[PDB]
From a paper:
Resistance nodulation and cell division (RND) efflux pumps are secondary active antiporters that are ubiquitous across all domains of life. As part of tripartite multidrug efflux systems in Gram-negative bacteria, they span the entire cell envelope and export a broad variety of structurally and chemically unrelated toxic substrates. During drug efflux, AcrB undergoes a functional rotation where each of the three protomers sequentially cycles through the conformational states loose (L), tight (T) and open (O). Substrates can enter the PD through several channels and bind to the access pocket (AP) in the L state and the deep binding pocket (DBP) in the T state.
For the V612N variant we obtained two crystal structures in different space groups, which represent not only the TTT conformation, but also the LTO conformation as seen in wildtype AcrB. Presumably, here, the closing of the DBP in the L state is also unfavourable due to the introduction of the hydrophilic asparagine within the aromatic cluster. This is likely less drastic than the effect of the V612F/W substitutions, but could still shift the equilibrium between the L and T states, hence, crystal structures were obtained in both LTO and TTT conformations. V612N also showed a similar reduced resistance for many of the tested drugs.
Numbering used by the authors:
A (entry chain A): 1 to 1043
B (entry chain A): 674 to 817
C (entry chain A): 50 to 145
D (entry chain A): 866 to 913
Amino acid sequence: MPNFFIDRPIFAWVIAIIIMLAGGLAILKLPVAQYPTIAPPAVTISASYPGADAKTVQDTVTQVIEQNMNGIDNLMYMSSNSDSTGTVQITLTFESGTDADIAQVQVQNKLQLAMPLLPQEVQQQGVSVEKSSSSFLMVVGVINTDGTMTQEDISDYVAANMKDAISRTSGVGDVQLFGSQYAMRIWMNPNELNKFQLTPVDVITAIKAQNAQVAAGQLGGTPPVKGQQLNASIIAQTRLTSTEEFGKILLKVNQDGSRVLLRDVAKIELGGENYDIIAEFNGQPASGLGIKLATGANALDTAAAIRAELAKMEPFFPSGLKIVYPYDTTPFVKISIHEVVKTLVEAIILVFLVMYLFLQNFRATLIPTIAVPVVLLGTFAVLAAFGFSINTLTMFGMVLAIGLLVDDAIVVVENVERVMAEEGLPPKEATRKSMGQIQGALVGIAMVLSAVFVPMAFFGGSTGAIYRQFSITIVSAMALSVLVALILTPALCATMLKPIAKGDHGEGKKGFFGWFNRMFEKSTHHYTDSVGGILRSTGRYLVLYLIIVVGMAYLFVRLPSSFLPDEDQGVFMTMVQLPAGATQERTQKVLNEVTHYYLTKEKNNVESVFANNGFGFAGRGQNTGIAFVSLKDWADRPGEENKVEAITMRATRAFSQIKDAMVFAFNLPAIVELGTATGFDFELIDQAGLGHEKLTQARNQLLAEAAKHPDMLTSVRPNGLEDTPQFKIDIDQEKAQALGVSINDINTTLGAAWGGSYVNDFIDRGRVKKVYVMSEAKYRMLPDDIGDWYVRAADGQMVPFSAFSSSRWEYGSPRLERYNGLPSMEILGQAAPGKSTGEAMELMEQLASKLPTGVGYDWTGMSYQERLSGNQAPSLYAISLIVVFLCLAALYESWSIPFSVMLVVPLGVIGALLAATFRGLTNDVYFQVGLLTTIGLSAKNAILIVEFAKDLMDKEGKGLIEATLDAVRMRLRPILMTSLAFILGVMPLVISTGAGSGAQNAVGTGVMGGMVTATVLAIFFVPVFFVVVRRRFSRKNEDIEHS
Amino acid sequence: LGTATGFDFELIDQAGLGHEKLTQARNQLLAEAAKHPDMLTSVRPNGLEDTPQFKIDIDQEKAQALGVSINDINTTLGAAWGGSYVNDFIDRGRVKKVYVMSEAKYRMLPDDIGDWYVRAADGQMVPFSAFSSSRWEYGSPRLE
Amino acid sequence: PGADAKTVQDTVTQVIEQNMNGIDNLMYMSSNSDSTGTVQITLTFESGTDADIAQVQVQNKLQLAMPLLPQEVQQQGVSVEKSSSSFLMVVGVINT
Amino acid sequence: ERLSGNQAPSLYAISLIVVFLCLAALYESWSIPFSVMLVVPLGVIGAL
């Protein structure tokens, strides 16, 4: 193949240009996002039952839906929480790769047949089936800088006008509002209702009667009579539209004629659908939109089109409406592109330099500088062909691939320049000779590199998804390089290189380059002599190799492993936890103290703070809250003291003074759709009919045993909320029956007053919205207020609640956790300093196996992925090893020679294990992908060294030692060129601080160290390996040359 | 697919303007587009124009006075003049619908409205002309 | 049955319209609500979107709005169709 | 039409380029391809 394109350079160029043309044509069209789909696909059932407690939600909704989730494909586990705010969320998670749409749909239908078993209240509020593991693209905040709009007014504009036109903008696939559109609120007054012998019952009845829509038919309706000349819609009662119309609803005409109107017994206003969430943006009223990307969509273009559409709506906002962007992942991604493109640009610059250092002419300098961009660019087209996207893992996969891409180009050009210089051939026939030597090896090189990286893609779970990115990206670029190395680079070597005379090694040049040629000629003779003297006592250095291998093992065991590096992403969070039953106003004072700290004592670094009172990570309730901290650009946060990692500590430090709450700030994980990165997640389950009480005790029993092993378990805790006091009220069935007061009159009065009631719909400015009746606030606050509510009897007398009700206090959960249809408690935790989580798990397993009978347990989340993946890394790379051996066995046509190449693996491994433990980093996936890229380069140089030595023995008849010292001489210069340009290119990644540095540090520090030891050791070790392996496995007449 | 010719333009209410302000904006656009016959030909709405319709109002106070529940009122009006799907029957082994509706001659003109009666809680039969006032107005037969 | 266009729009059309969100490869949603008591809401997808997958997502989104329609509309049925498909023939049945 | 108008130029700017590269490979020349490619307008007019 090299010869065909040596005789057609323009054809080779047409292939290269076509390759490049498809790569850029791709790039323009590939999706671009931070991380590919890594979280397993998950579907979320969310329903609402206004006014409920957690138990009510669980047993009228949660359990009903839970008992119908069966017969569904590729399902892993089903958790649920039912909380005191009247909200259930049941989440079902599927195995990696299950068709997202197909999964949702099956769950959708299974819920459908349970829908008639839910209460009308839950059905009317709606039961959403979501695809939920998808991540937030941005969070739009909508404030009013004038101050003429509450968060409910802002919400309603956003809902009515902005929400639906942003669901329509390029690239979005789900939206969620921070509040509610308007709900017509009827704030009842109990003393007025009792004044006119009225109850909430009658108010609801009247709103249902006078705010309604009626089918009235038609004048001249079909079928008509003969000669009808008029056909017209008959318009009967329509929906109400204003607070005044609701005000004049005629409740009752007294005997004297006086009309009891709705406004006479209640206050009437537009309002929120519920008031459980307080959303503030820098302490100002705010609503907003949480936005998620569409599957397979570009993230940069979705933000650009959304912000452009928001800019298209701006002039049509009422005064003061500012759109602010407190959360947005777009900027961190543009950095990653700029940085990886930067890294790829400056990688090529360092090859132009090394090529002109050793070869000293700009003609040879141009060939690698052409072929590598060809290969990089084309790889993008290859990734379009498999469905992939321009992401962190793939981009870093390409920068990790640079080393292999360049060595194909250097080996070819150098070997031509060497063949031209050592033999005096014209550029054409010398390229022919050079390629004839390395072609077969370059092919076997490609086969072996694949056997290393391909097994990565067949890891399972979320980690397997990550490796798949690296595996496919790296393999694709490398094979494309070998193709280019057999097509274009031979053509370029034949036509561009100018003749070098035979014997000319630049030793006669003057100045910088003349000195260099002679120095390297000296050191090469030193190297070949040193190698010649090492082969005299091979027994000694096989002992050095052994010490080297056991040192690798001791390093690998004591290097702590991680998932992905935490990154300074520009935002972080803070959790607020007041005591049980703590109120809304109490949380708000705390969140304002939180926002005041960030805007004062972090004034340089914090741009904005988005506080949410009412919901948190641990659950919902008046006693939980969240604030999102939006920081200023990394450009204006210089040094470590202005990074997220540092800002998060100073917040938690200063909130240790806070006495009202428990406030805790923390940075995001690298992949937020996944979470954890640290430790285990343990669920404790009620398998018998034990109940919440016996379960919480078993939880604390486990937590006390786990706190009594601080050597192994640290920070074991429940994820859920603790029980809170609650007001139990009992209806005397006998006295109610006695007084003639029906139980329905009793309950609907209590609920619609204290919980509120969705009555019907009205039309607010052409948009249909809800109508809630609820007691005014001052009459539903304390147990004394219970007495001021009255129900009418069958005789017509008004009876107070204190007549047929007794009330006490008791404790209950504001957030019931269930796991797999059974009551559960989520227990979080991790391994102690310097311990394994797989072994901290087994202690937790043992600590749970001493809990009372009827209690079971299970691992969930990350801990479950580990239970069914731990035995992979050995087996996958036992396979990987075998294919490398068989490839070498085919390339060299020998069962024994392969060992001579394969022994170079530990030489590169230690350098990584050094630099990582030296720099204090972790065995994360960036490091491991780096390990595979470094092992591959050391093996390639070993292959080409062994190839040249064996070729010299076969087709030139030389002896073992001569061919060894001769091939290792020839391969010296290219091997140094490669390791030089590669170790320089990874330097900005190693010293990197600021944005994306954690990943760049991770990919970087491991590779650089691995390559140093790979190049410095293997130049001195692979000549040993070939000699001892050839002497152990042979027949006769080898050390002595032949014909 | 259709078309092959020309454009299709939708005019939208983005604020809470309403059908009325929208139709006016439509005719404003149509008049400007008819005043550029050099460029725009045959600009027109796809939808139907508004038609007269018979508005009938129920006096909540008088109905309350006479002891005539509003449900008795509305279900009578609708099932007579619009008809009502009541339940199913079996026609030759095949389940089919059962509609109740006024006979044609009693649901044709506004005078026919008066000939329909609703019973009060006391047991007296009350005509529709007792608790209803009616006028004429225009509305759309096809809201886009 | 028996409605005007407004009644159809605001008891049915708007209710269903406000639930058509979170659907893949959707381009635009038009509707007409007419004086004959009939609404038709049509949702059009990009070329190549899986016909079955598209219908099904719309089907489910309507399902959760169904309890907010009137019993009259529910009893008459709410059809979800693939509609851009063309007429093959039209059979006429007369009695000579 | 609003999201397709800029296609006919770009798609056939691409189409032109591949015709040139193919001819460049067939004839092993960067210049000879022009000799074939100039025949396009000769057929176009007859259609127009």
